Design an enzyme around this catalytic site. Structure first.
Site: not given
Ligand SMILES: CNc1ncc2cc(-c3ccc(-c4cccc(C)n4)cc3Cl)c(=O)n(C[C@H]3OC[C@H](N)CO3)c2n1
Ligand SMILES: [Cl-]
Length: 268
Positions: A16-18, A126
């Site tokens: 994700s973020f990163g 998800d």
């Protein structure tokens, strides 16, 4: 306690973020997955990061990607997880379609994942082919849990903000089944802010075409607009489609090998 000494990065896996790497624990030689989040460039996601760590640390299932721990160095947070060398179900789709045997074999394993989570009173949130990772020998595991963006797999009751339950995961599984059959979820061309209102307004998606009736009926049960009419994960594990069409794990390694031949032959 220095993660740049403890670990060696071997190759980038994705973003994700990163950014994420295939790595190795230099103390044990265990191949791991390493994510590195810069905590100086993600202020508003931080509450979600410890939330996801808490949840994964409570899971001890062979169908959930293992979490081994976290390290801080400077403003960099290192998250270490089990490494799955087969790629995602979405990756496996890039090299061709799945047949119903392969689809059923895979949904069966995702269903075992979900049955574990729901019996521990957790919701994945998800479920989608990109969040289903395979080991290279064909185990099927869940990754990238949702936060308690892209709405294509969201159940209508989660879109309306109506507080939901685990039946949301069953809907998303229904959409994932269509994605494994057609390569992509319903309404893939619509702008996501349009899809956010078409999902509750429209009748549920169905699987159209040359697919068995049992497969069609499996997806129709998952995609009931009313959640209490969706089957539980354990019920779906005995659904005619799964029982009649699911096969041994080598039906998935054949897909893993196909994807590897595909990449090695220069396709993208
Ligand atoms: C291809 N083999 C492979 N094996 C294993 C992992 C493992 C992770 C992973 C998951 C989640 C997290 C994590 C844990 C807590 C909080 C937060 C914010 N992230 C940390 C990692 Cl290290 C991964 O990112 N990928 C890649 C990804 O790419 C995006 C896709 N949707 C799922 O897989 C993996 N890939
Ligand atoms: Cl494949």
């Amino acid at each position: 306690a220095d993660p740049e000494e403890l670990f060696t990065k071997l190759e980038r896996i994705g973003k994700s973020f990163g950014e994420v790497f295939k790595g190795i624990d230099n103390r044990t030689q265990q191949v791991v997955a390493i994510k590195i989040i810069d905590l100086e460039e993600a202020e508003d996601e931080i509450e979600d990061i410890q939330q996801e760590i808490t949840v994964l640390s409570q899971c001890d299932s062979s169908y959930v990607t293992k979490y081994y721990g976290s390290y801080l160095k400077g403003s960099k947070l290192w998250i270490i997880m089990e490494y799955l060398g087969g790629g995602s179900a979405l990756d496996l789709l890039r090299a061709g379609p799945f047949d119903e045997f392969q689809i059923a074999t895979m949904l069966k394993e995702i269903l075992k994942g979900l049955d574990y989570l729901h019996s521990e009173k957790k919701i994945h949130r998800d479920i989608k082919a990109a969040n289903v990772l395979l080991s290279e020998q064909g185990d099927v595991k869940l990754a990238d849990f949702g936060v308690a963006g892209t709405p294509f797999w969201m159940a209508p009751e989660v879109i309306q903000q109506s507080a939901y339950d685990s039946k949301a995961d069953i809907w998303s599984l229904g959409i994932t089944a269509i994605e494994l059959a057609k390569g992509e979820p319903p309404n893939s061309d619509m702008h996501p802010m349009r899809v956010l209102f078409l999902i509750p307004k429209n009748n549920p998606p169905t699987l159209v075409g040359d697919f068995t009736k049992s497969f069609k009926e499996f997806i129709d049960a998952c995609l009931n607009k009313d959640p209490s009419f969706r089957p539980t994960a354990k019920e779906l594990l005995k659904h005619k489609f799964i029982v009649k069409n699911s096969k041994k794990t080598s039906y998935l390694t054949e897909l893993i090998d196909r994807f590897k031949r595909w990449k090695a032959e220069g396709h993208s």
